[PDB]
Structure 1
Amino acid sequence: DEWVNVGSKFVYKEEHPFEKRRSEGEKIRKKYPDRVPVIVEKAPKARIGDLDKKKYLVPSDLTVGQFYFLIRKRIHLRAEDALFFFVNNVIPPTSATMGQLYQEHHEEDFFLYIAYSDESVY
């Protein structure tokens, strides 16, 4: 708005060229206007478990707090340990919805990229 968002390197972005990512992201957003296409990767330096899958298609009214719980169970992070999301190297508010987060932070390929970590700074 009206900025193009550029974030850190993701292995997804390295392995799928921009033109293919943008074609797919434009299609999924047209097909599902109220679902958010999210790429989730572990930050390189994080000392917690990896995810099986990295592509999530979620509700735009899902809260970030709800998405935290989802990722946490999927990496089997013990409840006592902290988990943090970074989008464009910023920690989003836990009260935001995935829809608001997408609107603010999506990249030019129409995807939203989230790195997760056990550290609260990066």
Structure 2
Amino acid sequence: GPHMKWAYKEENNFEKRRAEGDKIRRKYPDRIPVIVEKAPKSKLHDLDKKKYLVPSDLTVGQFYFLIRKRIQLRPEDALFFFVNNVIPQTMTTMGQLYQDHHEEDLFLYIAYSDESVYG
């Protein structure tokens, strides 16, 4: 996956992020909190925000659809996600990804790009 330098982590240290994580898991337990950021140098459009809440049963495939709309991409345009630095399967749900890969600050990080392979 791409070498990410998460703006969310640059701006907030672990303690501050974990405090937010605790608060989000407490107030919205029926939602999966995700931090979404673009791979460096990607030509894809930037997202207005990076903090999103998604249903636990939303699949990666349905997630791709929502993101494509937000960054004005067409179905035939290349779009790849990286979780835990690797590409997830489209049938996996957000709740499943969160259960297996949420960060210690209690957030699930997802990077997006138009490229599928990085050195």
Using the size of structure 1 for normalisation, the TM-score is: 0.89
Contact 2:45/2:71 (8 A) holds in 1: yes
Measured against aligned partners, the alpha-carbon deviations of 1:38-76 in whole angstroms (never above 9, x if no partner) come to 000000031211101110011111111111111110000
Of 70, 76, 81, which aligns to 1:74? 70
Output the aligned Cα RMSD: 1.4
Shift of 1:30: 2.1
Q: Distance in 2 between matches of 1:10 and 1:79?
A: 27
Of 18, 36, 40, which aligns to 1:40? 36
Of 49, 54, 58, which aligns to 1:58? 54
In percent, how many aligned pairs have the same letter?
82
Q: Distance in 1 between matches of 2:103 and 2:45?
A: 26
SS of the residue corresponding to residue 37 of structure 1 reads strand
Give the total of aligned pairs.
116
Higher deviation after alignment, 30-39 or 106-115: 30-39
Shift of 1:8: 4.1
Q: Distance in 2 between matches of 1:109 and 1:44?
A: 23
Shift of 1:9: 2.7
Contact 2:4/2:40 (8 A) holds in 1: no
Of 113, 117, 121, which aligns to 2:117? 121
Shift of 1:79: 2.3
Letter in 2 for 1:77: L
Unaligned ranges ≥5, structure 2: none
Unaligned ranges ≥5, structure 1: 1-6
Q: Distance in 2 between matches of 1:20 and 1:60?
A: 24
SS of the residue corresponding to residue 57 of structure 1 reads strand
Letter in 2 for 1:92: P
Q: Distance in 2 between matches of 1:96 and 1:44?
A: 25
Using the size of structure 2 for normalisation, the TM-score is: 0.91
Q: Distance in 2 between matches of 1:59 and 1:78?
A: 23
Task: Give 1:1-122 correspondences, 5 Å limit.
Answer: 8-122=4-118
